[PDB]
Amino acid sequence: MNPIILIIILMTVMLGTIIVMISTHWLLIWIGFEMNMLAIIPIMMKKHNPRATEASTKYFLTQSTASMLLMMAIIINLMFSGQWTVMKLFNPMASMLMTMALAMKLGMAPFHFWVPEVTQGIPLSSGLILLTWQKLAPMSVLYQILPSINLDLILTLSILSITIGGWGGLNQTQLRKIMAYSSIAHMGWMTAVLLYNPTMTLLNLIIYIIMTSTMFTLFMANSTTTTLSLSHTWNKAPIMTILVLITLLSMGGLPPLSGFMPKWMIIQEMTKNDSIILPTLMAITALLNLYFYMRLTYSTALTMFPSTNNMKMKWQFPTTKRMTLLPTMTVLSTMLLPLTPILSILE
Amino acid sequence: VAAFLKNVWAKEPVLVASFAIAGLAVILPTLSPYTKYSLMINRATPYNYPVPLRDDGNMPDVPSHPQDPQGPSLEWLKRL
Amino acid sequence: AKTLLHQYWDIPEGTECHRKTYAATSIGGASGLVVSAYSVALKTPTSFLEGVARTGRYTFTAAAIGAIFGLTSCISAQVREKPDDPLNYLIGGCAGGLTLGARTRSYGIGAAACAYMGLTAALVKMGQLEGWKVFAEPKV
Amino acid sequence: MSLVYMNIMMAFTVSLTGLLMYRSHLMSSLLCLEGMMLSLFILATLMILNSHFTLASMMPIILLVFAACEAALGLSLLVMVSNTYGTDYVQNLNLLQC
Amino acid sequence: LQYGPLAYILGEKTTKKMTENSKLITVDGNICSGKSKLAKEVAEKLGLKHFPEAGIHYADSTTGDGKPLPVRFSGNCSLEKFYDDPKSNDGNSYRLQAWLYASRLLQYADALEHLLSTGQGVVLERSIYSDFVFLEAMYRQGFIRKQCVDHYNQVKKVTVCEYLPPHVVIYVDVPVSEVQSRIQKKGNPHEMKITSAYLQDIENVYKGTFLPEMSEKCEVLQYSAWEAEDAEKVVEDIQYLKYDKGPWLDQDDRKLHNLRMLVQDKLEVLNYTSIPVFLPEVTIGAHQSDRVFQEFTELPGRKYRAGYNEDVGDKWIWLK
Amino acid sequence: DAPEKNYERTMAILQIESEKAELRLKELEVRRLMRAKGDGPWFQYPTIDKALIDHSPKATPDN
Amino acid sequence: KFYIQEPPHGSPNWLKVGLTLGTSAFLWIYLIKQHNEDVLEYKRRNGLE
Amino acid sequence: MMTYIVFILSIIFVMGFVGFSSKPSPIYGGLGLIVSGGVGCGIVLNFGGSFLGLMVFLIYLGGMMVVFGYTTAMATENKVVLGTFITGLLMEFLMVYYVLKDKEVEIVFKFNGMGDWVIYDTGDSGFFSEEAMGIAALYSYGTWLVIVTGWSLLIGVVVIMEITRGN
Amino acid sequence: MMTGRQARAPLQFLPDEARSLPPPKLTDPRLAYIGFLGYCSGLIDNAIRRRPVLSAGLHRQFLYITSFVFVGYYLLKRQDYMYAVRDHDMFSYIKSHPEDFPEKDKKTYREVFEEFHPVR
């Protein structure tokens, strides 16, 4: 791809999400989602192989279906309210359709079935964009419509995403599917706290984006898309194994790390609202996520897998890859828990 | 700036005419003295009913009848 | 299916055994139909007859679990004269687990489902007693 | 509410169930998707014309334009799929199960 | 880096420097074809940069002080022990072939980087397109296993697909008897242990597999032993070629920009040479891997990135 | 440390932590009341700005 | 010399070192100026002078 | 019968959607969506949307479904379809029978069964079409809408040229 | 929760009333911890590029420390502002709703009967 065309297309992805974040009219929300999907299709077809075309076709079909359901929810809102303000919806059917549409755009279970396929089909940088930047616009729409979101629907989606994303990553050896099921479980955690305190939704979103960007940046820096190619990293770059160790222990939510910060605050907001069974079962279900994170830490940092002879050639060459913000992201994804009360800046 | 223009006029006169007509479309309404009259004629066209005002007692510029002297006039449009 | 749970929980324990058994059977049948729907959705059966056989098998399995659960719970509430007691639903959940083991034709699945479904039904009874909320309304 | 809205919503749900139950062709899925768009156009238009809501009269055009651009993108994806397998069958798009 | 997307945006196009003499020419032949001077002769008539044939220590010549590293750090394999014991137990044969394929991949990346950054053509000797004719010649002699051929074909399948073929492929017809005569006149006591059937398999995979498949994607020139002695006839044949085959014709600034971005990142070039296929000839276990890695780091100029080694006299490190 | 110092330092610790606990309980009760009634500065979800309304005479009178 | 190829980081990028030190010194003087202006505004609004 | 003309056109509209959504072949599906677009244009025209209905003809049918049938003719060259078609037809005419015998129905929303002429306005708009004036205000009031739509169409050109190239 | 509070004046990182508050000291231990995180980022930046970790690029390590301290100072200002807003709203709501917050009669333990449970 032409680098100028790449810059214009990435600015258009950003512009679509920004239009979603700044607009007061529902048509401009829908336009921001259309602009974002249209611009992100070439980022997925960047390398021109049949797996990327299949991933882009599956992504197109799910996001287009969600976009039509979103427009039907907008149109039903216009029936029962005569207006277009991005605020609470004025019909429970429109609220259900918009919550379904946003759950499809997020890839929350049981609309999760595209996220491991599309994440596996595309390069690591475009899957980084898919799992971090593409969550931002539907979460902002969920933020603004929460006075009309049905509680049982959003909590069903939340627990179903956490359980399905926990069990889905246990069977995986591909790193992109591991990050995709990890994404599904973390979005379940974000929507579970949404009607109680959406500031903790924003906190979980930001910490998830930092940790996921860290893991994708490590995978890009080591050119690893499988568990077994990530297991060669100790014989090539031993600092990278320490970084994937601390970041995966943080994504499991183990204190004293920063990824313990969201779920703890989420439990802290769900028990104030007298929900005790639900954050309990959510936290116990997240042990599945920690189990396959620990599987990756065993294969990468805590043991030394056998290498190959040709690795000795790669000892003679330094990493020329721009590992953009990787030390900053690695520090923020691990050492941020003593600054947990900084979350009030999200209020 | 002069050999280039003659070169592109010899090779591609369709594109030279296209960019010339488009440039005259862009810059000439800012240079026309009659662009103001377009706005004046559009705002002088009465699509709606001129809903009258309650005479509170002190409105010297608002007429009491259409044939009164005060009020907006269209002599500029009859004359031009 | 929220009204199915309401017509289950409206009747007091150990009073009307046949209608409690029928209500729990209907709850189990609805859960079996949901499982059958996603089962023939995500996994295509080889024929229409195989699909309706899987649907009838899962629906009758979950309905028999619900029937033997509600029957055993109401009979244990009658013979002990303790309606507000989670040991009744512990026995009922173990009976439903033995039913799930009998449908899968295995003893180990039966004992595991006895233990876990009995503890789950005991927790559901305790949550009905003390008012435990799973989908709690936002209050603060 | 008024009687035509029942049929335009039912048309949307019919094209929704057509788009949610594939047979074989990706083109038939794209046709059901654009039928969903057409019904959204008609429903938006009937509301906006009934309400005499003047500025929203430009809304369905925008709804048309974006979605037809979306349709163009879909056709291009189909063509690239059809440049791989010879057909646009959805059962050829299963490499990402593993 | 020095070249990137920004330099491509700010005007650096490689078709500005892609002249008519910017030709990647690979000279091929059997073990004593005498091509090694012919290549150099072509590179001193057409004004091209000559790369000598990538051996075990090519990467050593491109990195560090340029001097060859000890064999446990580069290669872990011996050509002379392949000549002595070809069917050896330790797996020297395929380990040598896999290291040589990685070395030729690095050399082809260096050649394309020089061609795309300077516009000067490069003369190579036995590129990655002709490396496999040793592999099959080993497999037909029972020197390596079928699993070694499968590993080689996986690594070649995901590495050679990223590059462009040469413009000109020069082949030197030398029969097996003349190869053996030049081996016996060479005097190398290991190289005189090469059998006739191995040289005949090299010639068979040359003439039956390599040259037919390179006749479509580029222009094969084929000379005997005596008509390759005249360099002027070879350069006259090269200068009067009508280039009409292969994917060099449809290379704009964008595709060649992407190729130059590939061939300057040497770890990305060498990415799939170490794929996790646990083949016993190339698998190094963790204790030997750890020990040889830590011994490699203690070499001079090898502990840090190249501008950051006080032991070899790097200054201003606290401002770098 | 002297026992006097530890004693009075303990009293300062207990006063600070009891005041923080009472403020947390009041914060929970305030959040409950403001979510229930909507009359406080918190849980103020947006409605339509009335400054968007055109108050001019329209084309027809009955509006 | 030691290396067969001149490394990219054999000599320090003096433009980038100058931009680094200048940006860091600018951020420190802006931070101290902001902090002094903030304590002065706090003392002015709360009457502690 | 003539007071129900928008309702009759909406019945034909749903019948056309059951036609193509049962998916016989993408060419007959294209034909069904064409007939549906024509009758939906007729519905829009009968609520007074002349320009929006002509946009359905010019842009949806004459622009987009032409490209659909074109791509389908370049790519292409039952019992489930017929059963699905009669299923949707019987569901639609049961809806018709219920809302005509009761003058009220409730599938998900409550629907009146009177002729949909009843909801209209009883005045005039003077010397303009209100729908034409609201569409004309895209250039005066819809500046940001023009910007985001034109930028999305330019990006759409660029995106189609990227993904169809294969390089 | 407090999103209608900061909606009349949107997108202000620090509003004008935040200047009524004392700013964080430059010797704030939170700010020293953020500077420590900048130093750790500088060390990881030397480590992943195989530079000597403590010695190489002291200008870069110092810009890491400086940039984290710079961003973190304003983040701590906004943090302290938002908790001050939280308490201001709490106290104004308690003061305006006395019927919801009555003064509870505190009883001494001579009147308070607690049940005794023997550990035996």
Ligand SMILES: CCCCCCCCCCCCCCCCCC(=O)OC[C@H](COP(=O)(O)OCCN)OC(=O)CCCCCCCCCCCCCCCCC
């Ligand atoms: C209320 C919240 C409002 C919103 C707040 C902000 C949200 C930020 C969301 C971050 C999402 C970042 C997605 C990545 C950047 C987008 C463009 C992109 O992917 O560029 C990467 C680029 C591509 O390289 P390429 O050549 O394509 O790779 C193929 C192999 N040669 O180059 C590379 O691949 C180089 C490898 C390193 C790239 C690392 C990029 C890290 C960016 C994320 C930083 C962390 C998130 C920001 C901080 C927290 C914010 C919540």
Ligand SMILES: CCCCCCCCCCCCCCCCCC(=O)OC[C@H](COP(=O)(O)OCCN)OC(=O)CCCCCCCCCCCCCCCCC
């Ligand atoms: C600012 C005003 C508004 C401008 C935008 C609106 C334009 C309206 C007309 C629509 C034009 C859209 C399409 C334009 C395509 C331009 C690119 C192009 O055609 O480049 C190729 C062409 C050489 O043609 P070739 O590729 O060989 O095609 C086969 C025929 N030989 O290359 C050429 O022939 C060179 C063409 C560029 C130079 C033409 C210069 C004309 C100057 C006229 C006088 C100045 C007018 C004022 C505006 C400034 C123009 C630079």
Ligand SMILES: Nc1ncnc2c1ncn2[C@@H]1O[C@H](COP(=O)(O)O)[C@@H](O)[C@H]1O
């Ligand atoms: N499998 C192999 N067997 C023998 N020689 C090889 C093999 N692979 C590469 N070579 C190289 O080919 C050279 C023979 O050609 P020449 O350079 O003309 O002597 C040897 O000296 C090796 O460097």
